Design an enzyme around this catalytic site. Structure first.
Site, PDB file in Angstrom:
ATOM      1  N   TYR A  86       2.355  -4.752  12.116  1.00  0.00           N
ATOM      2  CA  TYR A  86       2.187  -3.624  11.999  1.00  0.00           C
ATOM      3  C   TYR A  86       3.153  -2.525  12.722  1.00  0.00           C
ATOM      4  O   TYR A  86       3.340  -1.555  12.721  1.00  0.00           O
ATOM      5  CB  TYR A  86       0.726  -2.365  11.941  1.00  0.00           C
ATOM      6  CG  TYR A  86      -0.069  -3.156  10.245  1.00  0.00           C
ATOM      7  CD1 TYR A  86      -1.346  -2.244   9.890  1.00  0.00           C
ATOM      8  CD2 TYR A  86      -0.599  -4.228  10.684  1.00  0.00           C
ATOM      9  CE1 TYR A  86      -1.325  -2.356   8.133  1.00  0.00           C
ATOM     10  CE2 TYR A  86      -1.273  -5.033   8.892  1.00  0.00           C
ATOM     11  CZ  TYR A  86      -1.930  -4.534   8.202  1.00  0.00           C
ATOM     12  OH  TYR A  86      -2.538  -4.575   7.068  1.00  0.00           O
ATOM     13  N   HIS A  97       0.569  -1.096  -0.191  1.00  0.00           N
ATOM     14  CA  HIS A  97      -0.354  -0.600   0.594  1.00  0.00           C
ATOM     15  C   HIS A  97       1.236   1.175  -0.075  1.00  0.00           C
ATOM     16  O   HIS A  97       0.377   1.919   0.300  1.00  0.00           O
ATOM     17  CB  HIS A  97      -1.056  -0.132   1.077  1.00  0.00           C
ATOM     18  CG  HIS A  97      -2.080  -1.191   1.080  1.00  0.00           C
ATOM     19  ND1 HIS A  97      -3.021  -0.810   0.816  1.00  0.00           N
ATOM     20  CD2 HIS A  97      -2.026  -2.370   1.769  1.00  0.00           C
ATOM     21  CE1 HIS A  97      -3.586  -1.751   1.466  1.00  0.00           C
ATOM     22  NE2 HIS A  97      -3.541  -3.184   1.747  1.00  0.00           N
TER      23      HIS A  97
HETATM   24  C1  HEM Z   1      -7.434  -8.703   5.493  1.00  0.00           C
HETATM   25  C2  HEM Z   1      -6.305  -8.595   5.159  1.00  0.00           C
HETATM   26  C3  HEM Z   1      -5.706  -7.440   5.519  1.00  0.00           C
HETATM   27  C4  HEM Z   1      -5.588  -5.931   4.902  1.00  0.00           C
HETATM   28  C5  HEM Z   1      -7.616  -5.891   4.781  1.00  0.00           C
HETATM   29  C6  HEM Z   1      -5.316  -5.481   5.310  1.00  0.00           C
HETATM   30  C7  HEM Z   1      -5.524  -3.415   4.973  1.00  0.00           C
HETATM   31  C8  HEM Z   1      -3.805  -2.880   4.913  1.00  0.00           C
HETATM   32  C9  HEM Z   1      -3.925  -1.641   4.783  1.00  0.00           C
HETATM   33  C10 HEM Z   1      -4.933  -0.693   4.256  1.00  0.00           C
HETATM   34  C11 HEM Z   1      -2.600  -1.248   4.550  1.00  0.00           C
HETATM   35  C12 HEM Z   1      -2.832   0.238   4.311  1.00  0.00           C
HETATM   36  C13 HEM Z   1      -2.629   1.444   5.663  1.00  0.00           C
HETATM   37  C14 HEM Z   1      -2.111   2.853   5.093  1.00  0.00           C
HETATM   38  O1  HEM Z   1      -3.235   3.549   4.127  1.00  0.00           O
HETATM   39  O2  HEM Z   1      -1.550   3.665   5.357  1.00  0.00           O
HETATM   40  C15 HEM Z   1      -2.060  -2.345   4.708  1.00  0.00           C
HETATM   41  C16 HEM Z   1      -0.200  -1.375   5.410  1.00  0.00           C
HETATM   42  C17 HEM Z   1       0.235  -3.117   5.691  1.00  0.00           C
HETATM   43  N1  HEM Z   1       0.071  -3.985   5.749  1.00  0.00           N
HETATM   44 FE1  HEM Z   1      -2.353  -4.597   5.793  1.00  0.00          FE
HETATM   45  N2  HEM Z   1      -3.994  -5.763   5.640  1.00  0.00           N
HETATM   46  C18 HEM Z   1      -4.150  -7.202   5.760  1.00  0.00           C
HETATM   47  C19 HEM Z   1      -3.571  -8.401   5.703  1.00  0.00           C
HETATM   48  C20 HEM Z   1      -1.963  -8.431   6.195  1.00  0.00           C
HETATM   49  C21 HEM Z   1      -1.645  -9.204   6.779  1.00  0.00           C
HETATM   50  C22 HEM Z   1      -1.402 -10.526   7.121  1.00  0.00           C
HETATM   51  C23 HEM Z   1      -0.328  -8.656   7.334  1.00  0.00           C
HETATM   52  C24 HEM Z   1       0.516  -8.798   7.716  1.00  0.00           C
HETATM   53  C25 HEM Z   1       0.834  -9.623   8.582  1.00  0.00           C
HETATM   54  C26 HEM Z   1      -0.175  -7.290   6.773  1.00  0.00           C
HETATM   55  C27 HEM Z   1       1.150  -6.056   6.728  1.00  0.00           C
HETATM   56  C28 HEM Z   1       0.717  -4.865   6.521  1.00  0.00           C
HETATM   57  C29 HEM Z   1       1.974  -4.109   6.757  1.00  0.00           C
HETATM   58  C30 HEM Z   1       3.123  -5.179   6.532  1.00  0.00           C
HETATM   59  C31 HEM Z   1       1.189  -2.892   6.057  1.00  0.00           C
HETATM   60  C32 HEM Z   1       2.824  -1.777   5.650  1.00  0.00           C
HETATM   61  C33 HEM Z   1       1.612  -0.547   6.744  1.00  0.00           C
HETATM   62  C34 HEM Z   1       2.521   0.687   7.299  1.00  0.00           C
HETATM   63  O3  HEM Z   1       3.798   0.240   6.733  1.00  0.00           O
HETATM   64  O4  HEM Z   1       2.462   1.249   7.879  1.00  0.00           O
HETATM   65  N3  HEM Z   1      -1.587  -7.150   6.107  1.00  0.00           N
HETATM   66  N4  HEM Z   1      -3.025  -2.793   5.196  1.00  0.00           N
END
Ligand code: HEM
Ligand code: HEM
Ligand code: HEM
Ligand SMILES: CC(=O)N[C@@H]1[C@@H](O)[C@H](O)[C@@H](CO)O[C@H]1O
Ligand SMILES: CC(=O)N[C@@H]1[C@@H](O)[C@H](O)[C@@H](CO)O[C@H]1O
Ligand SMILES: CC(=O)N[C@@H]1[C@@H](O)[C@H](O)[C@@H](CO)O[C@H]1O
Ligand SMILES: CC(=O)N[C@@H]1[C@@H](O)[C@H](O)[C@@H](CO)O[C@H]1O
Ligand SMILES: CC(=O)N[C@@H]1[C@@H](O)[C@H](O)[C@@H](CO)O[C@H]1O
Ligand SMILES: CC(=O)N[C@@H]1[C@@H](O)[C@H](O)[C@@H](CO)O[C@H]1O
Ligand SMILES: CC(=O)N[C@@H]1[C@@H](O)[C@H](O)[C@@H](CO)O[C@H]1O
Ligand SMILES: CC(=O)N[C@@H]1[C@@H](O)[C@H](O)[C@@H](CO)O[C@H]1O
Ligand SMILES: [Cl-]
Ligand SMILES: [Cl-]
Ligand SMILES: [Cl-]
Lengths: 701, 701, 150, 151, 50
Positions: free
Chosen positions: B363, B76
């Site tokens: 996160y 993202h």
């Molecule tokens: C239901 C499944 C998921 C949804 C709805 C989701 C949603 C999101 C969203 C919307 C963002 C962007 C947030 C922003 O705008 O700054 C994001 C970033 C991220 N997501 Fe997910 N995610 C999902 C699954 C996962 C999984 C399973 C992992 C890891 C275990 C993950 C790890 C991350 C990481 C590391 C970021 C970067 C956040 C940052 O650098 O601030 N996501 N996710």
């Protein structure tokens, strides 16, 4: 920015919380993102179960903890800070356009940090070392930092050699031994192969290497700087901070004892003094010289291994600083503070001192290491007192929110803001306009820099005989710790180019052949205010008296207490010491050592405490006191006397003196009956000013 | 803390500058340490000389610049944000103790960021992708983040597989090709070997993969969460943000055109809409279920690859969000914002969804990468609206100054502050107390998770025939880009477990053998609100109309302008387009494409602009317009029609329609004389709501 | 990975220098990017002139120096290490499948660090404190650390 | 050379490597390594994956057998600044008047393009300046371009 | 390109902020087609050659 709808920008400022100082009174604990919590038990699958990954309370707390530390300073890691104020003595606009110097009685907020150099973050305060004296003036035209030390000269003449000097003096790279000390092969190798180091090496071996406290040393800018007047005329200046407490120092074995008894001796001294209202003062002074003076005095003003003798150019008093408040949080304010010699303000400029020139690069770059990113000036202690405006943007840890969307110059969109500032508008910085350079692009040292030995000779001649012996003892101590004979011999040969008597005495201490006079660089010249013994203090505020009493003779405590009013009135702390706390007792034998007191008084009727180690050794096992190690009271006395401190004894206290082989006829020994305690106190005040009785120190040649 | 003098601590708070928003009006430029400067010329040894190391002005400026960048989000990376507000429809205390939901009309500040997933920081908005919908409620009991996407299900069932999915969909590691796309071997390999991915893969291939804008998609929490009441009773909930604009999407070739014409299409749309007062709204809704419902519906509520159909459990409206302000500085507020699903508040809890459970770790850890240190929550956009109080300390970039010197629990020195908060005092977070676990410690998947195909089948049945064709076209496009035949065949076989008709059509598109029905997981079931064509918008505010005119027929501009009042009144932007700027012209042919408008109107008397490429090709070189590429007006028209957009023509504008092979009898084609422009406008408003005319899209089986 | 030309990937391994232990004997000084240098005098506009920004030799040396330090351990900052070896007395497979314990006289390389706890990097060894006793077995099935105290 | 654009790049690129690599040992990354082993007295820093054996990491020293040896113009193939380079002047923040013609070379460049590519330049300028939202900037651009070539 | 836009390194952050996306909203991507860039190129007429 608004000759059209597209470039017109709506700014909606959000009501974001803007706390600086954090105040917990009344509050519930919250996460960093504001959810109320407890933090005392992990979330588990059953009370004897495994901890769950979903316990975000556990993870946020330990992630903060796991990340608390930051890199220490590569040099001057061990240090302590305080806030204060500076008052100008005058309007100095005739010589400098500097704003903090522009009016009589003009006051400027200050923050300073004092430090050693070589030791790492938790090393002992009383290491033999250079000491930093770094002060920030929070002026109306920017943060001005004077980043100085307690010695007038520095070891090297070019910034490119700085990592060489530092690796040489720091612990060896294979095993990181030894800590906070030059007493090893590499340092003395460097000082002898790079003979520019001799001047500062002698300072280091003198009492200047082991000051009594941050309050009892001076500060030096070392380098030539420039004062620049509004009209462009410049003066070459050298800064000294003259301590208004005076200069005083320890002897080596005492500095060692202090290192083992109270590693926080100098930081505690500064903290307590301020907390007790005894605010240290230092007068800002400058030798104010003409451009024509660069080579006039038989050395080069660009040369940082050379001081200008007060007798050649006097120091002009500029104003007075006082430090009057302790920091609120050490990590936030002291650990994170970043001083830079390149933090200059309009009316100040540089010189072509090749040591200074490199520092300007180094300190800006090093701030990245310690802060993890480029926004180190945004940390509160580093902020200027007026808001910053420039087109710098972004970077890790950006906690401001720029509203100027046209972040470049020249532009036609931002209404000319922020405006360029220079010599003639906005009080802008300007390089001194008569500065000039001319030459090939060369990696060569100036031949004006070649005399490494004459000023070391002057410095030696500037020390009383007792402190000359101290220098010999230090050199001999350090070079006995040096493991390499050839380095020992190189040091001797170098020292022989300075002064034959010095070198012979050192060679004798080291068991080496005695060299013969080598008169090329010898001199009889001397300068004042560069020694640390033989000249009394100017103030005894915040010094310590230990009053040795006993619970087994209750009147002794009362005797101590009746002297307290007189010391308090001089700003001297009287500490009544017994075996254990009781009504009126301040501290205990077990907690005490000679290093804790600047003068010692033995009470009437307690002589039986002062058994010598020999007496202690007869009666061992049963019926020897468990309340302190054997002969602790005796040792405090013998140590205090050996170190040169004033000692007094009331009544039968004189029995303790005799036991210690201290004749009541010696200088800085005061005796009186129980009826004369008032007069004994005033003699102790007298002795505190003299501070050390050098007639007790063994002399050679 | 004060039963003695030693532990009593004097706090002197220094008058430190505490700017948040920076305002340049009136100012001179200063360094970051407050010295006034110019920044336009390097300091040199003569005007044609080398730059000097002592130019600290040069170094501080370039050091800031050299350090502006920070790591982008691992997923993202490409996104855009805005502030807003949320209003509760009710007091929901009967089901949740959450404070922002505790009263009818209770308002809470909001900040959201929308994004794609796979592309890096500057990748094209209109990539086919998952889209993030991440919103922070700045509640009185902490920052609550719902970190959701525009699809109801996710690809995988366990967080440990997340780096597998992501490496598979990201560009190949040898050469970093291709950007922002799943159209490559690795992604489709993953989706076919890890058949949990099929549900989300179908969403991705539908119009949901290519939304019209952030304003025209819904948001989903995906996972089951819990509402927890004050008394400990919990409900299992799933969140949906229902867009109050409605759901609308592009077709693939249009998404491609947009990527090349305006990579900032969605961020610009959001920025402009807010700036123009057309504030997007989304209604917070929750399926509110009982604990007993975990396995009731024939799949597992812990399973994130499964949606609960609205027809089985309806969505309960909770409240309304509106986004009503653009950020002031993108880097400070948007780039630095860090959302976390572990940012929960009292009254919210987790479930044992193995995908959710790992996100809670990931996160918090990832915030270190992007911020360079542990104090990321201290960045303004991440701060809670009430001050933080806890015993976390220090870390890089600490810009607060703690005053509580007893930073541990339990202590007897700090007057009990900060106080522990829990279920029964201080509104502390609490895990839902009826939650229970029981089992061996196992690395095994639940057998309740084994059906990977039935819900993909439901989703397929839920799309109108035109959007079913879109899914086939996408799968065929992406799997033609996949270079590996065996992966292509695996995909077909997987798709055949979902729906035989789907799989046959794809195999035909790929030139592969047609599979035969495999009925195990087939179903006729369908659900509503999961498609993106065939259902009109609920609001046309902030949509765009292109009015194609000519400078060579001046009355055409005036015709455009007289329609503007009607569009403005609907919150629709009318853009008058000619060859070049002139009185009343908004944009130009050279700047324009079909993707820039949601409806197109051809003016009276300009038919001669609309020469087909064939006609253009005859007369080349001289006397062909230089003001736009050959047949640009024609192409805008033909493209708009192909994409399914409403098109209208006034007067002889109908000649352009005929040239384009567009019969005035087609749905979403409006014609009228110059005297009926008012009625033509209202028909265009009609067509904007219908949004796309699917009768134009080729259908197969 | 090779049922097609597109997914087939050519690997050309470049002859990159792979020094671990650095041995100075015989060498001239070079920058970190391999240009032979001296490092004892700044480049100046004349021998008494200002130092030049183009002196990259000065800047690379001081940038390294300015960045030598790293955060110390939050606890056990003050410590010292040594390498060694561990010999199993037996095959312990009856109670553990651990490989370094799987045979009589089986030897495993070791590295340990001993420390105090509370003091910072240059604090005194003989502080009253807990002492760390942390040892790594470099086993054939991974690094096994026993991170203990006295 | 004393090209004031070049002179600053020399600072900027060394500093910027810290940002992208998290620490000072960016030259140790394989693609940045020289093909022959490095020998100098630089030490430590985040991510140190070498193990120095010279325990006397300073110059001058009497302990390391003269290694590593200073290299210069006349031994060890050391870098050297061109020895006839010279500077002379006040220390000035002023631009050289030799730099004042901003327009003649733009004119030469225009004349150097075939008519079709000249049209391409016009189309690009027109495209970009139509996207520019500010009329006054559009007009400034025109006036500048008119100092280059009226056509 | 044979020439560059500016004549002094101290102006480099000015040129770059001018050509990069606007700081309020990070629009537009990878393009000089916006007010700030052409403002810079016209106020800093060294830029005309490049
Ligand atoms: C239901 C499944 C998921 C949804 C709805 C989701 C949603 C999101 C969203 C919307 C963002 C962007 C947030 C922003 O705008 O700054 C994001 C970033 C991220 N997501 Fe997910 N995610 C999902 C699954 C996962 C999984 C399973 C992992 C890891 C275990 C993950 C790890 C991350 C990481 C590391 C970021 C970067 C956040 C940052 O650098 O601030 N996501 N996710
Ligand atoms: C006249 C000679 C010098 C004096 C008087 C001096 C003074 C000081 C002082 C007082 C500090 C501690 C400031 C604090 O309390 O935070 C310090 C730190 C430092 N000095 Fe020097 N210094 C000198 C020479 C040099 C040279 C030649 C260099 C390198 C070119 C250098 C590099 C440093 C560095 C890198 C720090 C660490 C600063 C930080 O991390 O904030 N010093 N110096
Ligand atoms: C049985 C109790 C514990 C023992 C025996 C123990 C042992 C040690 C030892 C020996 C070290 C130094 C390792 C080295 O030489 O580099 C160390 C460091 C550390 N310990 Fe502990 N510890 C204990 C409890 C804890 C707890 C409960 C925590 C936190 C949850 C913790 C966190 C740390 C951290 C963060 C370090 C720094 C490690 C590093 O930076 O590499 N310790 N511990
Ligand atoms: C260097 C100097 O004193 N002169 C300048 C002047 O030429 C300029 O118009 C103004 C704004 O930059 O700043 C002052
Ligand atoms: C300080 C030194 O080494 N020598 C000086 C000499 O240069 C000077 O002429 C003389 C008179 O002040 O004092 C001595
Ligand atoms: C701390 C110190 O220097 N002296 C104290 C004095 O302030 C205090 O009033 C007295 C109580 O008996 O104990 C002693
Ligand atoms: C877990 C719970 O509800 N009970 C506690 C109570 O026992 C404790 O005295 C108080 C302060 O910690 O917080 C509440
Ligand atoms: C969604 C699915 O795959 N199958 C369901 C089935 O489980 C359910 O019994 C039936 C009635 O709602 O609808 C269909
Ligand atoms: C920007 C837009 O959508 N429409 C504009 C309108 O607002 C403006 O008043 C008119 C001036 O002729 O140009 C067109
Ligand atoms: C600058 C130059 O060419 N001369 C030196 C020479 O004087 C020196 O002995 C040797 C080692 O540093 O390197 C060469
Ligand atoms: C390039 C330019 O602007 N003008 C040049 C002029 O300086 C030169 O004398 C002439 C002969 O080469 O060519 C033309
Ligand atoms: Cl000078
Ligand atoms: Cl659960
Ligand atoms: Cl040149």
């Amino acid at each position: 920015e608004q000759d059209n709808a597209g470039d017109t920008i709506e700014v909606t400022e959000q009501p974001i919380d803007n706390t600086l100082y954090v105040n917990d009174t009344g509050s519930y604990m919250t996460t960093d993102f504001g959810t109320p919590i407890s933090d005392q038990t992990s979330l588990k699958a059953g009370p004897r179960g495994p901890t769950l990954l979903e316990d975000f309370i556990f993870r946020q707390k330990l992630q903060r903890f796991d990340h608390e530390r930051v890199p220490e300073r590569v040099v001057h890691a061990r240090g302590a800070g305080a806030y204060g104020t500076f008052k100008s003595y005058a309007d100095w606009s005739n010589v400098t356009a500097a704003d903090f110097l522009s009016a009589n009685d003009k006051e400027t907020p200050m923050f300073c940090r004092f430090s050693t150099v070589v030791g790492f973050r938790g090393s002992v305060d009383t290491a033999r070392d250079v000491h930093g004296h770094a002060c920030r003036f929070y002026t109306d035209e920017g943060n001005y930092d004077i980043v100085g030390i307690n010695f007038a000269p520095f070891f090297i003449q070019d910034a490119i050699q700085f990592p060489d000097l530092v690796h040489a003096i720091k612990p060896m790279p294979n095993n990181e031994i030894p800590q906070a000390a030059t007493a090893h092969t590499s340092a003395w190798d460097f000082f002898s192969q790079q003979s520019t180091a001799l001047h500062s090496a002698l300072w280091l071996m003198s009492g200047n290497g082991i000051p009594r406290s941050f309050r009892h040393m001076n500060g030096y800018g070392v380098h030539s700087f420039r004062f620049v007047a509004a009209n462009g005329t410049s003066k070459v200046v050298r800064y000294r901070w003259k301590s208004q407490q005076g200069v005083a120092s320890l002897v080596w074995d005492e500095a060692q004892a202090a290192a083992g008894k109270n590693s926080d001796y100098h930081r505690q001294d500064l903290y307590n003094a301020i907390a007790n209202g005894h605010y240290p003062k230092y007068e800002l002074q400058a030798q104010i010289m003409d451009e024509a003076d660069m080579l006039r005095f038989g050395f080069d003003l660009l040369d940082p291994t050379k001081l200008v003798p007060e007798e050649v150019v006097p120091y002009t008093p500029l104003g007075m600083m006082e430090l009057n408040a302790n920091p609120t949080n050490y990590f936030a304010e002291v650990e994170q503070a970043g001083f830079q010699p390149g933090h200059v303000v309009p009316g100040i400029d540089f010189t072509d001192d090749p040591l200074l020139q490199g520092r300007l690069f180094s300190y800006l770059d090093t701030q990245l290491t310690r802060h993890g990113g480029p926004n180190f000036e945004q940390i509160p202690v580093n902020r200027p007192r007026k808001p910053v405006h420039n087109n710098n943007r972004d970077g890790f840890g950006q906690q401001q929110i720029p509203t100027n969307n046209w972040a470049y110059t020249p532009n036609s969109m931002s209404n000319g803001y922020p405006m360029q500032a220079n010599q003639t508008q906005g009080h802008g910085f300007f390089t001194a306009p008569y500065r000039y350079a001319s030459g090939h692009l060369v990696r060569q040292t100036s031949p004006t820099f070649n005399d490494h030995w004459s000023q070391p000779a002057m410095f030696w001649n500037s020390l009383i005989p007792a402190e000359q012996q101290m220098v010999v003892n230090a050199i001999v101590f350090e070079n006995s710790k040096v493991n390499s004979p050839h380095v020992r011999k190189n040091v001797v040969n170098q020292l022989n180019m300075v002064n034959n008597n010095l070198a012979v005495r050192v060679a004798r201490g080291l068991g080496l052949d005695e060299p013969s006079p080598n008169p090329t660089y010898y001199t009889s010249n001397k300068t004042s205010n560069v020694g640390t013994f033989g000249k009394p203090l100017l103030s005894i505020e915040g010094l310590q008296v230990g009053f040795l009493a006993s619970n087994s003779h209750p009147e002794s405590i009362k005797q101590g207490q009746a002297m307290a009013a007189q010391f308090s009135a001089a700003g001297v702390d009287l500490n009544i010491v017994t075996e254990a706390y009781a009504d009126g007792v301040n501290t205990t034998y077990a907690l005490s050592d000679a290093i804790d007191f600047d003068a010692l008084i033995i009470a009437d009727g307690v002589q039986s405490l002062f058994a010598s180690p020999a007496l202690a050794n007869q009666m061992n096992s049963t019926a020897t006191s468990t309340l302190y190690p054997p002969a602790r009271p005796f040792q405090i006395l013998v140590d205090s006397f050996r170190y040169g401190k004033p000692v007094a004894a009331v009544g039968s206290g004189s029995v303790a003196l005799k036991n210690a082989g201290i004749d009541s006829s010696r200088s800085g020994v005061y005796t009186g009956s129980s009826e004369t305690t008032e007069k004994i106190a005033k003699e102790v005040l007298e002795g505190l000013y003299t501070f050390r009785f050098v007639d007790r120190f063994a002399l050679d040649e």
